DNA sequence: CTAGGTCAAAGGTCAG
DNA sequence: CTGACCTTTGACCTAG
């Protein structure tokens, strides 16, 4: 699992904000922190998140970061 | 100038699918591409694709993207 | 190692 | 439908 992101299952990078995940999932969680961005949902709030189709609901790819044990401490300034 | 449109010879806005073009040829090939569209030649499949007469014919516009080396493959899936 | 920065090249919109 | 004009993504690098 050291090598596949836990949010969409692409090659991971490496641990990112506690997490292991790909260079995406990362600086999408990165940019949503420092910039505050609040997202919503089109659908139920249950969109499928994967490489081919994680950028299709910002909702629910922040939610699944968090759920997966991201770190909103762990952005810095 | 390198800041060409390998399509149609108007000012590029960089590489869109591994070919230099312009801000026209790219939405063109992305919607071709994510609608799976289909065009027909009025005429004999050799239409002129330049800055002026680009909109002339969809099909000779997707056949010249092609040609020039377009990828499909990068034209990613709908986000909304 | 993993934090942050960069910027080419993806994305999107909506007036015409 | 087109394309000017805009935003977000992620591959890659470097400093801590
Ligand atoms: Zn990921
Ligand atoms: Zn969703
Ligand atoms: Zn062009
Ligand atoms: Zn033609």
């Given at each position: 699992?050291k090598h596949?992101?836990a949010?969409?299952?692409?090659?991971?990078?490496?641990?990112?904000?506690?997490?292991?995940?790909?260079?995406?999932?990362?600086?999408?969680?990165?940019?949503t922190?420092?910039?505050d961005?609040?997202?919503?949902?089109?659908?139920?709030?249950d969109?499928?998140?994967?490489?081919r189709?994680?950028?299709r609901?910002?909702?629910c790819?922040?939610?699944?970061?968090?759920?997966?044990?991201?770190?909103?401490?762990?952005?810095?300034?």
């Amino acid at each position: 699992t050291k090598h596949i992101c836990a949010i969409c299952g692409d090659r991971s990078s490496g641990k990112h904000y506690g997490v292991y995940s790909c260079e995406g999932c990362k600086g999408f969680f990165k940019r949503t922190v420092r910039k505050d961005l609040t997202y919503t949902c089109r659908d139920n709030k249950d969109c499928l998140i994967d490489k081919r189709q994680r950028n299709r609901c910002q909702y629910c790819r922040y939610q699944k970061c968090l759920a997966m044990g991201m770190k909103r401490e762990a952005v810095q300034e």
